[PDB]
Amino acid sequence: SPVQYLRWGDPAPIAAVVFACLGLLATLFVTVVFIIYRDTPVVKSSSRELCYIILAGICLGYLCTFCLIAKPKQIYCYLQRIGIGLSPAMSYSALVTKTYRAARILAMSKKNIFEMLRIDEGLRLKIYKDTEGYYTIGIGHLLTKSPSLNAAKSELDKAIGRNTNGVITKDEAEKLFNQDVDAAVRGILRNAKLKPVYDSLDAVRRAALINMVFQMGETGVAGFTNSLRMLQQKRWDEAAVNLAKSRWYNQTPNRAKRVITTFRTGTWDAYKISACAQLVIAFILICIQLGIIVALFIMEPPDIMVYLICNTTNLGVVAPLGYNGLLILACTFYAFKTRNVPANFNEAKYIAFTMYTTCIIWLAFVPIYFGSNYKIITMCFSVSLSATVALGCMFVPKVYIILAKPERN
Numbered sequence: 001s002p003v004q005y006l007r008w009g010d011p012a013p014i015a016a017v018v019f020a021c022l023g024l025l026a027t028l029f030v031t032v033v034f035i036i037y038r039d040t041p042v043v044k045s046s047s048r049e050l051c052y053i054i055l056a057g058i059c060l061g062y063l064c065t066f067c068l069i070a071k072p073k074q075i076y077c078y079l080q081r082i083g084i085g086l087s088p089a090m091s092y093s094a095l096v097t098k099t100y101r102a103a104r105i106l107a108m109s110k111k112n113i114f115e116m117l118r119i120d121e122g123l124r125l126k127i128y129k130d131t132e133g134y135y136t137i138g139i140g141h142l143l144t145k146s147p148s149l150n151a152a153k154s155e156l157d158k159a160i161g162r163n164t165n166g167v168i169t170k171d172e173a174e175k176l177f178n179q180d181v182d183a184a185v186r187g188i189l190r191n192a193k194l195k196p197v198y199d200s201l202d203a204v205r206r207a208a209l210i211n212m213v214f215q216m217g218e219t220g221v222a223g224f225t226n227s228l229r230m231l232q233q234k235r236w237d238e239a240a241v242n243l244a245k246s247r248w249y250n251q252t253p254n255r256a257k258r259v260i261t262t263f264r265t266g267t268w269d270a271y272k273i274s275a276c277a278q279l280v281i282a283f284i285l286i287c288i289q290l291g292i293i294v295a296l297f298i299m300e301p302p303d304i305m306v307y308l309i310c311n312t313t314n315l316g317v318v319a320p321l322g323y324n325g326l327l328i329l330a331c332t333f334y335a336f337k338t339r340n341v342p343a344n345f346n347e348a349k350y351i352a353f354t355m356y357t358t359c360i361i362w363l364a365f366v367p368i369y370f371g372s373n374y375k376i377i378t379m380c381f382s383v384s385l386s387a388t389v390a391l392g393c394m395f396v397p398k399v400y401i402i403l404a405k406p407e408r409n
């Protein structure tokens, strides 16, 4: 009885239970909310099936302490290992597919703007110089500022990752372009006249704005004061008419006509320019962790050594800890890639933050747990902590909006 130890002077098992109980209630609350309001845009805009898997993984995470703190039976030693291993696996391996999808979608987004400026501005598959004599390649991508032709080739190989000999491909030129796009966005966000307009526009209309920036510069686009205001107020037809009078339109009519049209419709008409799969992939990554656990049940049969001490060795912990580490490492990679993506009510910002802490939690777990003389309690807190973080950062801000701010919804 957890009360006995609490009264004998040890509040560790009673605390882990309360922690686990409060966690289960919290997870139960969140899921029910997502069920009732499943049709609300804040729940509809994300993969609902994946969230259910993440919420299920966290629930088992809290249930883990009930196997770590239990009456000494044989199967509880089984439930411990199958729980501490699979519960993070259910959460992170479903979260990686979510982030990976968000990474491909973003990459495909940068693909369109690349094809846009390839048509509007052009491209060179070998090294050249700009109007100021500096070595350049691709779509106006500066390589270096030294007169050395050798210097440019060195910088190119480091950027591409191979011996290019001053020659690249379309795909490699897009890579260099992605950098210049991000740099352009950085400048726009730091420009007081361009920032409000950029924030109001959709994905397509933002590319048309960056198009203008790459032609005239920031200090040039800011000259379209009246037109920029029209775009911000979503008055497309008035913006197009106003832009068609500019010196910019009369100087480069062929290109300007396409950019203006993109502001109009918010489509790529001027330019020639899966859910079920995610569940299967998530299922596969979970079964891999299960195969590891089942194998270790065979290699090293679990046996009983309030506290339930089992005979689980290092290898019985290290292997599923390492696999979970990869799931975490992969998630962070894609989450950091999509950290600024505003889809789903700035969802990804919260996702990235969770993966930052989880890496610290995982990294801290290794020296702490393996140097500890109180392993069971340190395993209870560790699992309940990283489960709480994933619940507090990813789900709570969505529950808040859904219950406290239904108008925002």
Ligand SMILES: COC(=O)N1CC[C@@H]2[C@H]1CCC[C@@]2(O)C#Cc1cccc(C)c1
Binding pocket: 057, 058, 060, 061, 084, 085, 087, 088, 091, 092, 317, 318, 320, 321, 322, 324, 325, 361, 362, 365, 382, 383, 384, 386, 387, 390
């Ligand atoms: C075999 O041991 C492990 O693989 N680990 C030991 C501790 C545990 C895990 C790896 C990452 C950190 C951890 O503390 C956790 C977790 C967790 C559980 C359920 C839901 C969520 C979102 C996270």
Ligand SMILES: CCCCCCCC/C=C\CCCCCCCC(=O)O
Binding pocket: 314, 318, 321, 322, 323, 325, 326, 328, 329, 359, 362, 363, 366, 370
């Ligand atoms: C942020 C997480 C990224 C790191 C993932 C790296 C994966 C490495 C795999 C396994 C490392 C497990 C460490 C176990 C060392 C054994 C210590 C001991 O025996 O006491």
